[PDB]
Amino acid sequence: SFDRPEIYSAPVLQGESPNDDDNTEIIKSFKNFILEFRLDSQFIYRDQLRNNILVKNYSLTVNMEHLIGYNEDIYKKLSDEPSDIIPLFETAITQVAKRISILSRAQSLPTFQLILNSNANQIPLRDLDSEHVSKIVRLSGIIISTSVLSSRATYLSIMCRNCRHTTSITINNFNSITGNTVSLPRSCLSTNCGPDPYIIIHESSKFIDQQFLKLQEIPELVPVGEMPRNLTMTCDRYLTNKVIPGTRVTIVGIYSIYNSGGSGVAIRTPYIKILGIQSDVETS
Amino acid sequence: ISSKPLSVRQIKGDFLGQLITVRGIITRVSDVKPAVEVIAYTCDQCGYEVFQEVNSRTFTPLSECTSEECSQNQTKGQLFMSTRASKFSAFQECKIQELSQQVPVGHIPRSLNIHVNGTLVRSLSPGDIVDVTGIFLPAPYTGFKALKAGLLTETYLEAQFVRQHKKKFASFSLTSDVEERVMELITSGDVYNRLAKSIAPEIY
Amino acid sequence: VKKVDDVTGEKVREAFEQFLEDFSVQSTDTGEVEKVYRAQIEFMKIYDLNTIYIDYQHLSMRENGALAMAISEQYYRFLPFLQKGLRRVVRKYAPELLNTSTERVFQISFFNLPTVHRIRDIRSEKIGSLLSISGTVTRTSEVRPELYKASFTCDMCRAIVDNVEQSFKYTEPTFCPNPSCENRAFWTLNVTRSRFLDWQKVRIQENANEIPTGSMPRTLDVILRGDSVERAKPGDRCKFTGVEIVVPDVTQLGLPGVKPSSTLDTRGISKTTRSLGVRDLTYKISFLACHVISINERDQEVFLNSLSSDEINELKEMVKDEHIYDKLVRSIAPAVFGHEAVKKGILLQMLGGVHKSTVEGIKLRGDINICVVGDPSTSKSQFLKYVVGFAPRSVYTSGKASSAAGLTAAVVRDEEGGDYTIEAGALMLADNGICCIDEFDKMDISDQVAIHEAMEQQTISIAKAGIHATLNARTSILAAANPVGGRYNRKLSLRGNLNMTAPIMSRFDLFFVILDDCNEKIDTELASHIVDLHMKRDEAIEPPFSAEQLRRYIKYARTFKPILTKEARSYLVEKYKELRKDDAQGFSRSSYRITVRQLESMIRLSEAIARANCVDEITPSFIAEAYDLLRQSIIRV
Amino acid sequence: LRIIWGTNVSIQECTTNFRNFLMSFKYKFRKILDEREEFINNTTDEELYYIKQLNEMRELGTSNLNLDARNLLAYKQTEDLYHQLLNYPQEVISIMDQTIKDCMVSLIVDNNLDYDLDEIETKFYKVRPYNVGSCKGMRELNPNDIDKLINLKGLVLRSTPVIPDMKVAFFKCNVCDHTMAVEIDRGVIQEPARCERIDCNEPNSMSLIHNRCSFADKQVIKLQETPDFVPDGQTPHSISLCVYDELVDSCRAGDRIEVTGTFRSIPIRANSRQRVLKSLYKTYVDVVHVKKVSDKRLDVDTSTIEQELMQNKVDHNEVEEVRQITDQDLAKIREVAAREDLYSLLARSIAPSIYELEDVKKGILLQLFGGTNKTFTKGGRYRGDINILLCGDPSTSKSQILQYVHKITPRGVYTSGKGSSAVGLTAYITRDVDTKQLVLESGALVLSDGGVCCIDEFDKMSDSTRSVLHEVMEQQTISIAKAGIITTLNARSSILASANPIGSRYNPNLPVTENIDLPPPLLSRFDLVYLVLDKVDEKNDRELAKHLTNLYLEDKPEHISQDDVLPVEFLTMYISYAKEHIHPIITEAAKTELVRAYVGMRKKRITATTRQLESMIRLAEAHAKMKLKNVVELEDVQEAVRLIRSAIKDYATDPKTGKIDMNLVQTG
Amino acid sequence: RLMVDRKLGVVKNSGYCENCRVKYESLEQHIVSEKHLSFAENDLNFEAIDSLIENLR
Ligand SMILES: Nc1ncnc2c1ncn2[C@@H]1O[C@H](COP(=O)(O)OP(=O)(O)OP(O)(O)=S)[C@@H](O)[C@H]1O
Ligand SMILES: Nc1ncnc2c1ncn2[C@@H]1O[C@H](COP(=O)(O)OP(=O)(O)OP(O)(O)=S)[C@@H](O)[C@H]1O
Ligand SMILES: Nc1ncnc2c1ncn2[C@@H]1O[C@H](COP(=O)(O)OP(=O)(O)OP(O)(O)=S)[C@@H](O)[C@H]1O
Ligand SMILES: [Mg+2]
Ligand SMILES: [Mg+2]
Ligand SMILES: [Zn+2]
Ligand SMILES: [Zn+2]
Ligand SMILES: [Zn+2]
Ligand SMILES: [Zn+2]
Ligand SMILES: [Zn+2]
Structure with missing residues (x-):
């Protein structure tokens, strides 16, 4: 009738040489970029993060050209493997934000969202080949649909049915996907109870907003006899309810894939995980 | 309450979790072995020392590092035991038994397991008639599985203090009170005859 | 690739x-x-x-x-x-030799x-290297088939991949013959379509002269493969040449030290955010022999054909000698002085009679069993010492250091949870040889009954643990015993002097009673021999024949089938009558009395004498010599 | 700077201190340390000790330096290095090995010697600290003593065969036959999960080739603790020692050894199926040094370990089996052997604290010397082991004489007669708790091989237990044929038996054989039967009472209550030298005297068998070996005959009837 | 790899001495040490220089 043995660690020695690709080196370099970047003798990102913390806006807006001006290699990493590098940037923002918030409360916050925008060259919606898959693309267009906000679990408590084993599943990343990559466990995880024995305790879970937008190539630059081409986009948290249908926008996103465009073999439906929306001057 | 001597039979499950004193005779003492409490490992990748607490009879060693750096990274480090950095306890498992004056009529005395840890080891030897004060604690069941009806638990006594009824001649120290008593014996005179005649004084 | x-x-x-x-x-x-x-x-x-x-x-x-x-x-x-x-x-x-004639x-x-290395000279530096060892064989396996070139059938592609070389352990293939399958882990072994070798596992103990002070003998498991199987049998001291290898040993668990272990390399593996693959690298040293030599002869001509010409020269000279019997007797136990009847008996025992089986299978045995009893320090154990070390397939043991399972075969178990085996006893390591049991009196009654079970039928039946084997123990028993009270009683019968049970006593053909006396000249001369045997080492020993040529002569003479001529039958009858008349006379008071067992002893002793003289016909003088040798053994009370 | 994490050890400082100690240590430092400044001789205690040792190791090609740990206490700079070595043996010993290599390189280069430096650089030099602090037994070590340099002392009971410990794992590709060779790291070998060849990257292509890996020697030795301090109520303990790569097979069963090694603890897996360890660790010792020579003990019989000695030369173990005799010590030995009263000096040097028993202590000395071992070129063996029985009146110091010969002999087991069994005295089958297997362990008569087995209460042990001693006392072997063990085991051990006559008093009415009450076959095997009688003589009482009461004048007595007695340190060395280097050869005059005397004795009463002639010879040889004589004259034979006659008290025994004339006894 | 600073756990003239083959932290204690005095008092070590002292004079 004893308790749960604990496991803990402490740094004693230098380990193996910090390698540049290590997630912890990448997080350190993002943290240094956030804390040390200067634009016109101003720590623009540090001040922006602090102000966002004060207004309870748990997100950071970053221009990727500023990242080019700081570290080109890890800009390459972000622009070529966004799905693996964006969570590291969000972790760096979360650490810096925790430090800033605790240091500023004397005269918890969730994982921060990286809303990255850019002014680089934009790929036309008709010029998206299969080489852009799982990569950061900038593409212009017009929003023709904005779905209702849907609730996505970012932290949910679960309990086994034929037990009372309490567990928590945290979703801080991979919130932008048509499917659900992380589901409830198929076993009790207390190691028989059965398949999928967990139920969600909804009064102790945390949820976030998601929205489906429908980008379309502007109808001015369309072939005379063909359908204008549209593209599904998914945004979450602070990128929701930012634009209305009919708004001409510049979308920075990850050109990704989901499985559902009719009769075909091994074909897939492309979409865009939105990392930032840049609305232009529109109807007031 | 914690010092009134109890027999092995008188220690029921109501006394479980309490600090209690058991009066008995020690019948078997094991060798002082190193029982691991917090096993330590070193990781050659991140340079961390990962400590895993041990609570039961057996434990499963860690294979991959669980420190901040390795958990955050994708190339985990394989971590090796560090015996010198691990936390060990001098462990003894003594067995106390009911005295003949405590066993009821027609009964066989029953024994109790005493778990001696730390600097308290080597304070109990077989044949010692002692008052052992310790925390009566439960242990996971170790009997036959088919005979388990519920959450049955074994019990032991995590020894905290030992009082010897008959102090050993080797552990004699000439403190002040020992000295005053010896002078009050000597000054009375006739030590040899007094001590001889005091051996079984009803024998004549 | x-x-x-x-x-x-x-x-x-x-x-x-x-x-x-x-x-x-x-x-x-x-x-x-x-x-x-x-x-x-x-x-x-x-x-x-x-x-x-x-x-x-x-x-x-x-x-x-x-x-x-x-x-x-x-x-x-x-x-x-x-x-x-x-x-x-x-x-x-x-x-044309590259085919089986696959x-x-x-x-x-x-x-x-x-x-040549000892068992204790085996060290881990020499793993997987050619080297020679020596040892005494204790247990040999039945030859067993070992998978050499396995054939495998894939569950996806039911093709047949053959010639899958099994180096030292069961190894499935890695790539299928058909390119489409792309399977590596799922295969079935089909045994008929496979190939096998012959494998025997020999167990070898350290030689008695190689065991260090206070240490116990070491044992090694040698693996005979191919044509070398069955070349070693229990009891023989064989030297092996081959590879010192390592085999898995799970019994090293719990041993002190950091036992080696292996883990799969988890870097360069591309996780996405339990694959242990942990094995125990604990091994024990074994031996794989490609050559065995020891360090069925019943036919005379095949024995003489494969033997050096000079040895033929000396053997035929020894046969041509006239007092060959006397010279052979003088060449038996040269260190012992003056016991010539005992030397005669030992020589005849080491020669032996013929084994004769009746129509219904009485199976008359022709092995001479000898018991030597007498006063203390009369050289009784120096004759047993001489026999072991000269006679081939001879096993020496003591009464108090032996058990029924050590003399006869035992049923032993090397590993708990492992099956049981028959390790060969003293009465089987001395098969077709001599078992020299010193201090027969000290031995327990149950052990004596166990030896009795082998003296009656020359076979031992063990029905213990699920092994019901009937082992054959064709051995001659040379026993040394001490009378009760530690000294022979001249006024008491041989049976009253010996605590040895009667069923055992019957199967002993000869009882040599040696008594010492305070004779002036005999003591002066024994003492000169003992001190000269101490001053000199081998110059004090002057035998007519060295052990080499004496052993060669005995090996040659054991190949004969002596036959007794017609007059020999009648004189055997007459000598048996004379023995019976001598017994129960009234005043003779023989130590042990005469019956038809003495008559059979006489026949086999005559056959042994005929072998000693190297003639296929038993002359009546041989029966006379056997009669004298038997009669002088009985001591009047 | 830069000390090691978890230790006080700094590589630079420890290396500098150890190098300074090696270059500038003289044994006069330790002689000052041990408060023995008046033993300081300028000739050999003023030379750099370890410089000479390093030079000798360079010349001899050896690789192991035997470092006396207490020497580090003598030097001022290494007073802390002693504690660092004791507390952290691993790091400190590694630094010491490196420092030895640097020191030898410096010795070769700085003195500009001719010696090649290639084979020095590639050689691995090792340090063997032995004389660390001797205390705390083995059971008094706490978990805080894990990984510390400890010193045990005990008896070797058993040793497992050579276990291969993998150092390099040899893998091979099942596809392209490409091989890497992984190195072990703290007992873990990283099995490759992919062929490192860029041509093929098959995941599970690599397979371990067991017979092509690199292995090293590991051996586990079962030791019985014989601590200096034994707490009340505890029983003898058994521990497992681990010897590695040169110390394998250096210890045989029955050896009394002082072993210095690291006190280690390992977690033991509960089951062979799953990987789960037990929370209760198992303790053992990693052996770093073995000492088999005691300065108060006879050297091991070199005639029994010749194969072992020369196997030790091939193994380059450098384990000192026999003590070193210097030229000065040899000269002193010769000078003492040249004395006129050498026999009486050596006899009274045996057990100086036992009262005068000149013949008992003269027979004991001859047994310690032993006869001449004669091996036959054509096959045969004579052993000079002398068996002595001490039958006598109770309270005669028979047991104190067995206790001295047990303590002074190199190997041997002290038994009590009724506490012994026939199986117990020979090999038996036991069960190991580590391997859960059935193994063979030696008996008292086998563990005593090459030494003296002391058997107290020889009369109380039964007839069947006494049966096994016949072959040992005559052939010096045990021919065992039992289930699982059929072999001849060498048991070349002298037998020192003690007994009292029936009725616990030597009744003069009964003859000698009635009192002794032993079968002729066993009483013949004894080369010397002593009748120790407690006669009432007033001067005998006067002097035995002064002797006993003088031992109580001072709390710990220094016994010099004689004319002069040699120290046990000198006595053991003299006896060992005589045993090793002197092999007496019988001369013709000795032969004639031997035959004369044997015939004279060969003329109820105790019998005189042929074995008595063989006790004469060896006894004479023992005497000839005592005086360092390589030949036996008639004086040695006369002394042997006189000792045989006086042991049984023939001068007070009537030839017709075996009565002892109590008035004729010569107690003195 | 395991090295850490001495802040955890535990007379400017210092250097080697080719005479004694030992490193010293203090000149005034090396020259008064046992081995250095023994080396200095032994005239056999200073032999070839002894040729020069009186070869010039
Ligand atoms: N169950 C049994 N029944 C009869 N005889 C047996 C039995 N088991 C062993 N034996 C005898 O023991 C001999 C040894 O052969 P095996 O038992 O096959 O080999 P082994 O010595 O047990 O070696 P391994 O290790 O089992 S290959 C056989 O030839 C039989 O004489
Ligand atoms: N006739 C003999 N020739 C040679 N040596 C002899 C003779 N008689 C006795 N001896 C010696 O006397 C001793 C006899 O010892 P063993 O041969 O063991 O006698 P034993 O008859 O077996 O004695 P028991 O029965 O065991 S008391 C040895 O030293 C022999 O060498
Ligand atoms: N000659 C002696 N020299 C020295 N001490 C002696 C002597 N005789 C007796 N003692 C002492 O008195 C005791 C008797 O000696 P023991 O060794 O007990 O005699 P023992 O011959 O073994 O007695 P038994 O025969 O076994 S009852 C011991 O404690 C000795 O110290
Ligand atoms: Mg005998
Ligand atoms: Mg005694
Ligand atoms: Zn459950
Ligand atoms: Zn790590
Ligand atoms: Zn296939
Ligand atoms: Zn490959
Ligand atoms: Zn100097």
Whole structure:
């Protein structure tokens, strides 16, 4: 009738040489970029993060050209493997934000969202080949649909049915996907109870907003006899309810894939995980 | 309450979790072995020392590092035991038994397991008639599985203090009170005859 | 894929090829240059043998010793290359030997290594290297089939992949023959379509002269493979040449120290955010022998044919000798002084009679059993000491240091949870030899009954643990005993002097009672011999025949079937009558009385004497000599 | 700077201190340390000790330096290095090995010697600290003593065969036959999960080739603790020692050894199926040094370990089996052997604290010397082991004489007669708790091989237990044929038996054989039967009472209550030298005297068998070996005959009837 | 790899001495040490220089 043995660690020695690709080196370099970047003798990102913390806006807006001006290699990493590098940037923002918030409360916050925008060259919606898959693309267009906000679990408590084993599943990343990559466990995880024995305790879970937008190539630059081409986009948290249908926008996103465009073999439906929306001057 | 001597039979499950004193005779003492409490490992990748607490009879060693750096990274480090950095306890498992004056009529005395840890080891030897004060604690069941009806638990006594009824001649120290008593014996005179005649004084 | 080639392996193979082809030897004034190994190859071609015998002495000379180092030091590495070189040499010279008459498996059998190692000289530096050891065989396995070239069927592609070489352990293949399947882990072994070798596991103990002070004998498991199986039998001291290998040993769990372990490398593996693969690298040293030599003869002519001419010269001279019986007796136990009847009995026992089976199977036995009893310090154990160390397949044991399971076979178990086995007893390691039991009186009654079970039927039945085997123990028992009270009683019968039970006492053909007396001259002369035996070492021993030629003569004389002529039958009857008349006379008071067992003792003693004289006909003088030898054994009370 | 994490050890400072100690240590430092400044001789205690040792190791080609740990206490700079070595043996010993290599390189280069430096650089030099602090037994070590340099002392009972410990794992590709060779790291070998060749990257292509890996020697030795301090109520303990790569097979069963090694603890897996360890660790010792020579003990019989000695030369173990005799010590030995009263000096040097028993202590000395071992070129063996029985009146110091010969002999087991069994005295089958297997362990008569087995209460042990001693006392072997063990085991052990006559008093009415009450077959095997009688003589009482009461004048007595007695340190060395280097050869005059005397004795009463002639010879040889004589004259035979006659008290025994004339006893 | 600073756990003239083959932290204690005094008092070590002292004079 004893308790749960604990496991803990402490740094004693230098380990193996910090390698540049290590997630912890990448997080350190993002943290240094956030804390040390200067634009016109101003720590623009540090001040922006602090102000966002004060207004309870748990997100950071970053221009990727500023990242080019700081570290080109890890800009390459972000622009070529966004799905693996964006969570590291969000972790760096979360650490810096925790430090800033605790240091500023004397005269918890969730994982921060990286809303990255850019002014680089934009790929036309008709010029998206299969080489852009799982990569950061900038593409212009017009929003023709904005779905209702849907609730996505970012932290949910679960309990086994034929037990009372309490567990928590945290979703801080991979919130932008048509499917659900992380589901409830198929076993009790207390190691028989059965398949999928967990139920969600909804009064102790945390949820976030998601929205489906429908980008379309502007109808001015369309072939005379063909359908204008549209593209599904998914945004979450602070990128929701930012634009209305009919708004001409510049979308920075990850050109990704989901499985559902009719009769075909091994074909897939492309979409865009939105990392930032840049609305232009529109109807007031 | 914690010092009134109890027999092995008188220690029921109501006394479980309490600090209690058991009066008995020690019948078997094991060798002082190193029982691991917090096993330590070193990781050659991140340079961390990962400590895993041990609570039961057996434990499963860690294979991959669980420190901040390795958990955050994708190339985990394989971590090796560090015996010198691990936390060990001098462990003894003594067995106390009911005295003949405590066993009821027609009964066989029953024994109790005493778990001696730390600097308290080597304070109990077989044949010692002692008052052992310790925390009566439960242990996971170790009997036959088919005979388990519920959450049955074994019990032991995590020894905290030992009082010897008959102090050993080797552990004699000439403190002040020992000295005053010896002078009050000597000054009375006739030590040899007094001590001889005091051996079984009803024998004549 | 470009398979990696072992450059030094190819070089060693080429060096072995030239060694096999171009090696030459100079004959001893009987011919010119002869190529030994090409002749051996054509020999094994004609006689369809599978094993080629390579002399290490011959191999050392070639390549200024560079082939020698590599083969002896890295034998496990260069063995396939040696096999390839031998196969190529056979393919060019005598190309019809490469077929079974699928493929012939070839056994390269190195021997004549410069040094021989003990069991305790075995060290882990020499793993996978050629070397020679020596040891006394205790247990041999039944030859068993070992998977050599397995055939596998894939569950996806039901094709048949063959010639899957099983090096040392069960190994499934990695790639399917059909390109489409792309399977590696799922296979089935089909046993008929597989190939096998012969495997025997010998257990060898340390030799009695190699055990250190206070230590216990060490045991090793030798693996005989190919044509070397059944070449070693329990009791024989054999030297093995082969590879010192390692085999898994799970019993090393709980041993002190950091037992090695292996884990899969988890870097360069591309996780996405339990694959343990942990094994125990605990091994024990075993031996894989490619050559066994010991360090069925009943036919006379085959024995004389395979024997050196000079030894024929001396053997026929010994036969031509006139007092060959007396010289043989004087050559038995030269260290002992003056007990000549006991030496005669020992010589006849070491020669033996003939085994005769009746129509219904009474199976009369022709092994002389001798008991030596007497006063203290009369050389009784110095005759048992002499017999063990001279007589082939002779086993010495003591009364109090023996058990019924140590003399007869036992049912033992090496591993808990392992099956049971029969390890051979003293009465079986001395099969067709002599079991010298010293202090027979000290032995327990149950052990005596166990030995009785072997003296009656010359067989031992063990029905313990699910093993119901009937083992045969054809042994002669030379026993030494002390009378009750520690001193012989002249006024008491032989039975009253000995606590030995009557069922045992009956099967002893001869009872030699040795008594010491305070004779002036005899004591002066025994003492001179004891002190000269102490001053000198072997110059004080002057036997007419050395142990070598005496053993050769006995080996030759054991091949005869003596027959008694017609007058011998009647004189045997007359001598039995004379023994019966001598017994129960009224005043003789014989130590042990006479019956038809004495008559059978006389027949086999006469056969042994005929063997001693090396004649196939038992002259009546031989019956007279046997009668005298038997009669003088009985002591009047 | 830069000390090691978890230790006080700094590599630079420890290396500098150890190098300074090696270059500038003289044994006069330790002689000052041990408060023995008046033993300081300028000739050999003023030379750099370890410089000479390093030079000798360079010349001899050896690789192991035997460092006396207490020497580090003598030097001022290494007073802390002693504690660092004791507390952290691993790091400190590694630094010491490196420092030895640097020191030898410096010795070769700085003195500009001719010696090649290639084979020095590639040689691995090792340090063997032995004389660390001797205390705390083995059971008094706490978990805080894990990984510390401890010193045990005990008896070797058993040793497992050579276990291969993998150091390099040899893998091979099932596809392209490409091989890497992984190195072990703290007992873990990283099995490759992919072929490192860029041509093929098959995941599970690699397979371990067991017979092509690199292995090292490991051996587990079962030791019985014989601590200096034994707490009340505890029983003898058994521990497992681990010897590695040169110390394998250096210890045989029955050896009394002082072993210095690291006190280690390992977690033991509960089951062979799953990987789960037990929370209760198992303790053992990693052996770093073995000492088999005691300065108060006879050297091991070199005639029994010749194969072992020369196997030790091949193994380059450098284990000192026999003590070193210097030229000065040899000269002193010769000078003492040249004395006129050498026999009486050596006899009274045996057990100086036992009262005068000149013949008992003269027989004991001859047994310690032993006869001449004669091996036959054509096959045969004579052993000079002398068996002595001490039958006598109770309270005669028979047991104190067995206790001295047990303590002074190199090997041997002290038994009590009724506490012994026939199986117990020979090999038996036991069960190991580590391997859960059935193994063979030696008996008292086998563990005593090469030494003296002391058997107290020889009369109380039964007839069947006494049966096993016949073959030992005559052939010096045990021919065992039992289930699982059929072999001849060498048992070349002298037998020192003690007994009292029936009725616990030597009744003069009964003859000698009635009192002794032993079968002729066993009483013949004894080369010397002593009748120790407690006669009432007033001067005998006067002097035995002064002797006993003088031992109580001072709390710990220094016994010099004689004319002169040699120290046990000198006595053992003299006896060992005589045993090793002197092999007496019988001369013709000795032969004639031997035959004369044997015939004279060969003329109820105790019998005189042929074995008595063989006790004469060896006894004479023992005497000839005592005086360092390589030949036996008639004086040695006369002394042997006189000792045989006086042991049984023939001068007070009537030839017709075996009565002892109590008035004729010569107690003195 | 395991090295850490001495802040955890535990006379400017210092250097080697080719005479004694030992490193010293203090000149005034090396020259008064046992081995250095023994080396200095032994005239056999200073032999070839002894040729020069009186070869010039
Ligand atoms: N169950 C049994 N029944 C009869 N005889 C047996 C039995 N088991 C062993 N034996 C005898 O023991 C001999 C040894 O052969 P095996 O038992 O096959 O080998 P083994 O010595 O047990 O070796 P391994 O290790 O089992 S291959 C056999 O030839 C039989 O004489
Ligand atoms: N006739 C003899 N020839 C040679 N040696 C003899 C003779 N008689 C006695 N001896 C010696 O006397 C001793 C006899 O010892 P053993 O041969 O063991 O006698 P034993 O008859 O077996 O004695 P028991 O029965 O065991 S008391 C040895 O030293 C022999 O060498
Ligand atoms: N000659 C002696 N020299 C020295 N001490 C002696 C002597 N005789 C007796 N003692 C002492 O008195 C005791 C008797 O000696 P023990 O060794 O007990 O005699 P023992 O011959 O073994 O007695 P038994 O025969 O076994 S009852 C011991 O404690 C000795 O110290
Ligand atoms: Mg005998
Ligand atoms: Mg006694
Ligand atoms: Zn559950
Ligand atoms: Zn780590
Ligand atoms: Zn397939
Ligand atoms: Zn490969
Ligand atoms: Zn100096």
